[PDB]
Design an enzyme around this catalytic site. Structure first.
Site, PDB file in Angstrom:
ATOM      1  N   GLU A  22     -13.333  -2.510  14.558  1.00 25.51           N
ATOM      2  CA  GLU A  22     -14.341  -1.786  13.740  1.00 25.51           C
ATOM      3  C   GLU A  22     -13.786  -1.495  12.325  1.00 25.51           C
ATOM      4  O   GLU A  22     -14.520  -1.625  11.348  1.00 25.51           O
ATOM      5  CB  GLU A  22     -14.834  -0.460  14.379  1.00 25.51           C
ATOM      6  CG  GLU A  22     -15.994   0.104  13.534  1.00 25.51           C
ATOM      7  CD  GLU A  22     -16.686   1.288  14.122  1.00 25.51           C
ATOM      8  OE1 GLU A  22     -16.588   1.438  15.314  1.00 25.51           O
ATOM      9  OE2 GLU A  22     -17.348   2.072  13.408  1.00 25.51           O
TER      10      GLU A  22
ATOM     11  N   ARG B 182     -18.650  13.240  17.950  1.00 25.94           N
ATOM     12  CA  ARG B 182     -19.277  12.678  19.126  1.00 25.94           C
ATOM     13  C   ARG B 182     -18.854  13.461  20.367  1.00 25.94           C
ATOM     14  O   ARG B 182     -19.706  13.878  21.154  1.00 25.94           O
ATOM     15  CB  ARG B 182     -19.001  11.167  19.278  1.00 25.94           C
ATOM     16  CG  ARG B 182     -19.925  10.558  20.312  1.00 25.94           C
ATOM     17  CD  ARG B 182     -20.018   9.044  20.299  1.00 25.94           C
ATOM     18  NE  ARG B 182     -20.967   8.550  19.297  1.00 25.94           N
ATOM     19  CZ  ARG B 182     -22.286   8.521  19.481  1.00 25.94           C
ATOM     20  NH1 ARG B 182     -22.821   8.942  20.635  1.00 25.94           N
ATOM     21  NH2 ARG B 182     -23.064   8.013  18.544  1.00 25.94           N
TER      22      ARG B 182
ATOM     23  N   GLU C  94     -21.919   1.187  25.426  1.00 33.04           N
ATOM     24  CA  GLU C  94     -21.019   2.336  25.690  1.00 33.04           C
ATOM     25  C   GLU C  94     -21.406   3.324  26.807  1.00 33.04           C
ATOM     26  O   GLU C  94     -20.536   3.874  27.470  1.00 33.04           O
ATOM     27  CB  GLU C  94     -20.766   3.139  24.391  1.00 33.04           C
ATOM     28  CG  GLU C  94     -20.300   2.290  23.220  1.00 33.04           C
ATOM     29  CD  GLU C  94     -20.235   3.091  21.947  1.00 33.04           C
ATOM     30  OE1 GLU C  94     -21.291   3.349  21.339  1.00 33.04           O
ATOM     31  OE2 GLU C  94     -19.126   3.491  21.572  1.00 33.04           O
TER      32      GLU C  94
END
Ligand SMILES: Cc1cc2nc3c(=O)[nH]c(=O)nc-3n(C[C@H](O)[C@H](O)[C@H](O)COP(=O)(O)OP(=O)(O)OC[C@H]3O[C@@H](n4cnc5c(N)ncnc54)[C@H](O)[C@@H]3O)c2cc1C
Ligand SMILES: O=c1[nH]c(=O)c2[nH]c(=O)[nH]c2[nH]1
Ligand code: FES
Ligand code: FES
Ligand SMILES: [Ca+2]
Ligand SMILES: [Ca+2]
Lengths: 1289, 48, 49, 49
Positions: free
Chosen positions: A776, A854, A1235
């Protein structure tokens, strides 16, 4: 100056100047250009390099076939052999049955492990055209896959063996196997089987390799140069040379010598020549065990049990019995057996020959034997067992260092005939010191003693004393090791009682308690079951509309044939250079000097790049707080100081070893606590806070407090980071080929470092051999360096990291420490919750703040909690920077939630599934961050899973097993999950596409997403096909590039199908409006006619498309606004059986019900549930990174980092996609999938905790209710928490 | 950062063309280019 | 791109007639930015069909 | 002017790159009665016709 002559895929290869250092893998990839065979690890653990070898055996007069790791086989060992790679058995024009079946049954996702898996299965078929299921599983012990969760591969290949919803594939349609159609054994090699073998000499840059043909040449050579290093299989030498920088300038390889390969059945035992591979050793002992009486085969079965969970077929085919003995690793599984049982070793030199029984003197020091320099091991005799002689072997459930601290053991006892009294006793262990050792003080005390309880307790106190470990003995885990020495002896003790009883004498010895019997069983996995359930499409759906159908990954066939191109498979330009990164060996230090003098003497050396060589800006990273190349200061072991450029990677590597750095240490901050102590954080505390904490804690009947630590995770994508930069020489233009999820940031980091506008840089991604969040951002530290090198040289430059480098430099999932306090009612209803979270972010910010955000959004998991406070801090430390990992903060927060919940249930004395269910949210409830939960499917997933897993009945069977079993236990948990979908940065929720239709009617479609194994491109073709109303076959996606779609977000947050699906859909709609008038004028006339009429009317047949997720944007100031577009939901119930004496366990059964909306593609979506689930299973149970106290990562490969293997998956594995749950918020009513399922592997963690609880109630004494199980629940952690008479004293 | 698309195709066709040999009508051209050149030379009459 | 730089491409090819130069000229008048911000790098069938 | 402009043949060859040369008729209008490739095959590095 001997020629080296072998065959690859039938074609003859003649190498006039073979270099002893050249591995088959390099030769295939780089000299022959056959890139189907992959580099995944270079140490024999991953199998991606697996190929087949065929040869004419002279010791058998038959053609033989075995598999090997190309990465460890020196081409010089290969004279007069025939190699077959993935390209040799088939291709897309004519797939081999093996290649067709893995592809069609969805067992290839990223594709990187597929050829090596194909070669393992192919080899098996060449040796056993009708294999059993057990054989099919075993063929893959040395083959790792990170994407699939393995089930599809085994399921696909099961069709070779045993000689509601639709299905995922149709085995009826598989082409049958015809063995007569395999490639011929090269006729040339059967003629050359006549000329006797002549000695060969190969000379390379540094090494000479003598391939000796007779014992005489060998002992002669060892008499004259005792330094000559024996190499047989290279499975240990290859490691010493590649990873520990050992060079041996003279090598002799004796593998041809008949006396080193003989097998002789004699009176005392069976003699193996030293070069005999463990695969033969296995094979003849199996035959012997099967045909002889139990009593003669005790030692034999001991050997075999150690060979069970000992490397794969690829390794065993070439690893010699002698090699293992002589390597003399402290962790050899073989040498304790050979020691305990007193095996006869024959040693020879020129003019000498002696015989020794292996004993404690055979191993004097670390990695030394009693061999004289000039002696070779000739042969080893494995003894038959005598009457009244019993043997067991044992081995530690895991492995964490290269060389030490793994318990492994041989145990032997001989009885005075007709008695229960001890004549001989031998207890030999490895991983308890720096050599294989005997318990020589302890065992003699037991002579004459009756085999009873006093023996047991006397042997235990003896071993505890004689093998005591100092609290800082090398390799740690000292409590766990001590316990296994004791526990392994106890098993031998019960095994011996059991066996005494079989010989009638159960009257003298004492009967075995039937609840103890389960302690002595040898590991047995029952047959796998498996069911996959999904929804059929509407009956009316056109058969050309593939949306919702299980269409295989478009590239599966190409992946199974080794034709799919990955980054390092791309041909090198003539003038192409290589680059190797140079990294800090200290956690925190000033650089005082760099000396390149030794690097300059390496041939092909071009330059050493450092901070000074950067044209514009040495400041990079997501938050601009990282260096391209270190300046003045290194901040972690792994910090990149510079880059060697050279002609070949071998020269780059040697030149890099020749860069000497001098340091002056600075005060280092390593752990989360180190940084707490130092106020060392990335920015300020993050907080979500709802309702009234003092009021909720006041209301509460019970209050529980505690801590949880969660370890990190290495992504272990089977393809490591790789970049090729190609300078174009005009106007700063450069084009890069990269294995990355983020073309935008790659582009823009390259441009900033060079000080050229983005419009000069193009980043191209075809596919990645896996990503998982690791590519990423972190791929850019390789990209910038490469790009710099190519600018300076004006030549193409490439670099692909070796595994060790990659694991070290690129960082992982964030470790987390939490401290919680939860308040609840006696009813189970929680009313108050405080959790302070900490993550270890390492040395740059990177994505760490978003990850903590998150976690905080998921600290509720599935549960309404009216009074709640979560805080997050991300620690800044002298470790590699940690980054995105599939889940991204989610699994850490959600595991903490489920951990205090587990304690809620136990404290209330109520059933976990009831406490869970009654705290669960309901439709229209608001989360702690005030987002309303619409289309709440979780209760349906929950109810479907309780029913299909048959959970309440299974709870009773678990109870029963537990009351009836003392040293094994079972546990069962059912765990839910809610996972918010959308990047936490709102503006990242965008995507674009570009489509062209050519005048032949074909479509070339591209979008900003990258293919990393998740079948994104497949889904996008499915999408465009439905939206255009034409077949998938007219639409192609060839790659992703910055100069076709700009400013794209990374492929990440599971959203890329959502985002690019809309983009693609819009571009298709635009094409369709421009075609409408041609459609009306010619309403039936085919697609091609409309396209040509549009063309010759000068209508544009090119369009962009674009989309942004509407209505997003949470504020932490106000606690309002939606961070997520919608939510994924899912439930997994899992059952385990733990071995309370070793801490090992079996995953017995897992049931998953997952809400993926109306799936775009149920085959890929089931694919993603299993794969993500199995990575979760690694996170929580297997995968452990270990660091020096100075911050140096030590687990830098598969040998010590253990991702899930074929044999780790649940024996029965059921996955169902939720029916009738269309998701209006996303493309064609689907949901993101990548995910959400990973955290449901939680259910295995909690099942383990449930079974430990049962063990702890069994073996007392008093307390502690609410014990500690940190993640990952490794065997170590499981064994230590099973408090009993062995852990105490 | 406000998720507006920064990529676009553009396209153009010259309007109003199509000549017919059969009817000697319609425009083959969108416009004409024009120009003029004056040139002077000297030759060698004996050699060319 | 997000640095403000423009990559431009079109179906014409460069054969010495200065076409990309002209197209960079047009684009800079149309966008009202200098020509130094706009680059043309090549002509390709997979950007303009 | 500096020779750094890249034309097609200036592009670096890949290490596995091959070269091709066309074989053309030496007759204005004729039947092809045969093609014999025997000498071509004796040239080092010949791959195929
Ligand atoms: C993936 C993998 C997993 C493994 N797992 C295990 C495991 O679980 N348990 C375990 O115990 N081992 C394990 N090993 C080690 C393996 O058993 C040994 O590497 C192997 O047996 C060595 O044999 P070789 O022929 O490959 O030796 P080489 O690497 O060729 O040589 C090793 C040493 O033996 C010497 N040698 C070989 N033959 C003679 C001879 N006759 N006389 C004197 N010296 C000789 C060489 O000089 C050298 O020092 C593993 C290896 C790999 C790659
Ligand atoms: O909300 C997310 N943002 C990301 O940048 C990212 N990356 C990832 O792998 N998952 C997520 N999730
Ligand atoms: S690459 Fe050979 S085993 Fe991993
Ligand atoms: S498909 Fe096996 S490693 Fe990715
Ligand atoms: Ca990584
Ligand atoms: Ca970080």
């Amino acid at each position: 100056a001997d020629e080296l002559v072998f065959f690859v895929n039938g074609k003859k290869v003649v190498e006039k100047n073979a270099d002893p250092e050249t591995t088959l893998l390099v030769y295939l990839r780089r000299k022959l250009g056959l890139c189907g065979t992959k580099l995944g690890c270079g140490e024999g653990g991953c199998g991606a390099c697996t190929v087949m070898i065929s040869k004419y055996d002279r010791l058998q007069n038959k053609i033989v076939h075995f598999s090997v790791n190309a990465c460890l086989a020196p081409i010089c060992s290969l004279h007069h052999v025939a190699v077959t790679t993935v390209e040799g058995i088939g291709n897309t024009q004519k797939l081999h049955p093996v290649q067709e079946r893995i592809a069609r049954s969805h067992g290839s996702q990223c594709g990187f492990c597929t050829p090596g898996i194909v070669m393992s299965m192919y080899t098996l078929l060449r040796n056993q055209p009708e294999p059993t299921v057990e054989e099919i599983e075993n063929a893959f012990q040395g083959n790792l896959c990170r994407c699939t969760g393995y089930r599809p591969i085994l399921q696909g290949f099961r069709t070779f063996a045993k000689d509601l919803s639709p299905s995922l594939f149709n085995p009826e349609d598989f082409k049958p196997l015809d063995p007569t159609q395999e490639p011929i054994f090269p006729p040339e090699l059967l003629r050359l089987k006549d000329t006797p073998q002549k000695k060969l000499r190969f000379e390379g840059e540094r090494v000479t390799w003598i391939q000796a043909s007779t014992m005489e040449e060998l002992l002669d050579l060892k008499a004259q140069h005792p330094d000559a290093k024996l190499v047989v299989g290279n499975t240990e030498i290859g490691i010493e040379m590649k990873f520990k920088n050992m060079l041996f300038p003279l090598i002799v390889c004796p593998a041809w010598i008949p006396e080193l390969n003989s097998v002789v059945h004699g009176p005392e035992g069976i003699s193996f020549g030293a070069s005999c591979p463990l695969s033969l050793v296995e094979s003849v002992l199996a035959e012997e065990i099967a045909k002889l009486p139990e009593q003669k085969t005790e030692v034999f079965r001991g050997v075999m049990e150690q060979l069970r969970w000992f490397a794969g077929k690829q390794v065993k085919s070439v690893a010699s019995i002698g090699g293992n003995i002589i390597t003399a690793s402290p962790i050899s599984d073989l040498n304790p057996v050979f020691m305990a049982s007193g095996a006869k070793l024959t040693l020879v030199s020129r003019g000498t020959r002696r015989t020794v029984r292996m004993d404690h003197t055979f191993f004097p020091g670390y990695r030394k034997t009693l061999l004289r320099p000039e002696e070779i091991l000739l042969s080893i005799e494995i003894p038959y067992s005598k009457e009244g002689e019993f043997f067991s072997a044992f081995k530690q459930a895991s492995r964490r260092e290269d060389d030490i601290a793994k318990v492994t053991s041989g145990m032997r006892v001989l009885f005075k005939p007709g008695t229960i009294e001890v004549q001989e006793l031998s207890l030999c262990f490895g991983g308890m010191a720096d050599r294989t050792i005997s318990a020589l003080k302890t065992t003699p005390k037991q002579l004459s003693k009756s085999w009873n309880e006093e023996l047991l307790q006397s042997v235990c106190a003896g071993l505890a004393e004689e093998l005591q470990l100092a609290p800082d003995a090398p390799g740690g885990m000292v409590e766990f090791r001590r316990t296994l020495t004791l526990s392994f002896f106890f098993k031998f003790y019960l095994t011996v009682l059991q066996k005494l009883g079989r010989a009638d004498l159960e009257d003298m010895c004492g009967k075995l308690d039937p609840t103890f019997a389960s302690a002595t069983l040898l590991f047995q996995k029952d047959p796998p079951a498996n069911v996959q359930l999904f929804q059929e499409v509407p009956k009316d759906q056109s058969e050309e509309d593939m949306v919702g159908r299980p269409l295989p990954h478009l590239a599966a066939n190409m992946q199974a044939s080794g034709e799919a191109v990955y980054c390092d498979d791309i041909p090198r330009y003539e003038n192409e250079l290589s680059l190797r990164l140079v990294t800090s060996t200290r956690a925190h230090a000033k650089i005082t000097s760099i000396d390149t003098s030794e690097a300059k003497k390496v041939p092909g050396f071009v330059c050493f790049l450092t901070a000074e060589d950067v044209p514009n800006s040495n400041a990079t990273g997501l938050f601009n707080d990282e260096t391209v190349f270190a300046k003045d200061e290194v901040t972690c072991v792994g910090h990149i100081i510079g880059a060697v450029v050279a002609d070949t990677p071998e020269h780059a590597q040697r030149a890099a070893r020749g860069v000497k750095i001098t340091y002056e240490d600075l005060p280092a901050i390593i752990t989360i606590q180190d940084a707490i102590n130092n106020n060392s954080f990335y920015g300020s505390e993050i907080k979500i806070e709802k309702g009234d904490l003092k009021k909720g804690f006041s209301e509460a009947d019970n209050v529980v407090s505690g801590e949880l630590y969660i370890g990190g995770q290495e992504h272990f994508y089977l393809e490591t980071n790789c970049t090729i930069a190609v300078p174009k020489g005009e106007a700063g233009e450069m084009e890069l080929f990269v294995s990355t999820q983020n073309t935008m940031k790659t582009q823009s980091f390259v441009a900033k470092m060079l000080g050229v506008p983005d419009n000069r840089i193009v980043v191209r991604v075809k596919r990645m051999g896996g990503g998982f969040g690791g590519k990423e951002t972190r791929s850019t530290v390789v990209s910038t360096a490469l790009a710099l090198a190519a600018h300076k040289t004006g030549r193409p430059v490439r670099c692909m990291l070796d595994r060790d480098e990659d694991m070290l430099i690129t960082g992982g999932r964030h470790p987390f420490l939490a401290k919680y306090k939860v308040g609840f009612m006696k009813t189970g209803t929680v009313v108050a919750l405080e959790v302070a979270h900490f993550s270890n972010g390492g040395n740059t910010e990177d994505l760490s703040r978003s990850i903590m955000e998150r976690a905080l959004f998921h600290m509720d998991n599935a549960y309404k909690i009216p009074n709640i406070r979560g805080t997050g801090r991300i620690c800044k430390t002298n470790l590699p920077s940690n980054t995105a990992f599939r889940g991204f903060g989610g699994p850490q927060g959600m595991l903490i939630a489920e951990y205090w919940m587990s304690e809620v249930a136990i404290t209330c004395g109520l059933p976990a599934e009831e406490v869970r269910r009654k705290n669960m949210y309901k439709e229209g409830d608001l989360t702690h961050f005030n987002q309303k939960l619409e289309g709440f499917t979780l209760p349906r997933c929950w109810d479907e899973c309780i029913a299909s897993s048959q959970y309440l009945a299974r709870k009773r069977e678990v109870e029963k097993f537990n009351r009836e079993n003392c040293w094994k236990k079972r546990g069962l948990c059912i765990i839910p999950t809610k996972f918010g979908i959308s990047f936490t940065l709102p503006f990242l929720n965008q995507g674009g596409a570009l489509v062209h239709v050519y005048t032949d009617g074909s479509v070339l479609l591209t979008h900003g997403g990258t293919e990393m194994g998740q079948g994104l491109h497949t889904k996008m073709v499915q999408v465009a096909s439905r939206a255009l109303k034409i077949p998938t076959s007219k639409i192609h996606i060839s790659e992703t590039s910055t100069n076709t779609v700009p400013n794209t977000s990374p492929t990440a947050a599971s959203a890329s199908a959502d985002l690019n699906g809309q983009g693609v859909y819009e571009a298709c709609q635009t094409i369709l409006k421009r075609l409408e008038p041609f459609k009306k004028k010619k309403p039936t006339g085919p697609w091609e006619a409309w396209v040509m009429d549009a063309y010759t009317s000068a209508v544009s047949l090119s369009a962009t498309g674009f989309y942004k997720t509407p209505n997003l944007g949470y504020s932490f100031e106000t606690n309002s606004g939606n961070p997520f577009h919608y939510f994924s939901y899912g439930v997994a119930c899992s059952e385990v059986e733990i071995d309370c004496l070793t801490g090992d366990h079996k995953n017995l059964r897992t049931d998953i019900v997952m809400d993926v909306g109306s799936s775009l593609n149920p085959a890929i979506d089931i694919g993603q549930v299993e794969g993500a689930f199995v990575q979760g299973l690694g996170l929580f149970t297997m995968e452990e990174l270990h660091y020096s106290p100075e911050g140096s990562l030590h687990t830098r490969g598969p040998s010590t980092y253990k991702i899930p293997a074929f044999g780790s998956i649940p024996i029965e594995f059921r996955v169902s996609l939720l029916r009738d749950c269309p998701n209006k918020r996303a493309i064609y009513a689907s949901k993101a999938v990548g995910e959400p399922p990973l955290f449901l592997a939680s259910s295995i963690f909690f099942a383990i905790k449930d079974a430990i609880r049962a063990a702890r109630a069994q073996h007392g004494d008093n307390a502690k209710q609410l014990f500690q199980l940190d993640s990952p629940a490794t065997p170590e952690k499981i064994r230590n928490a099973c408090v009993d008479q062995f852990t105490t004293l």
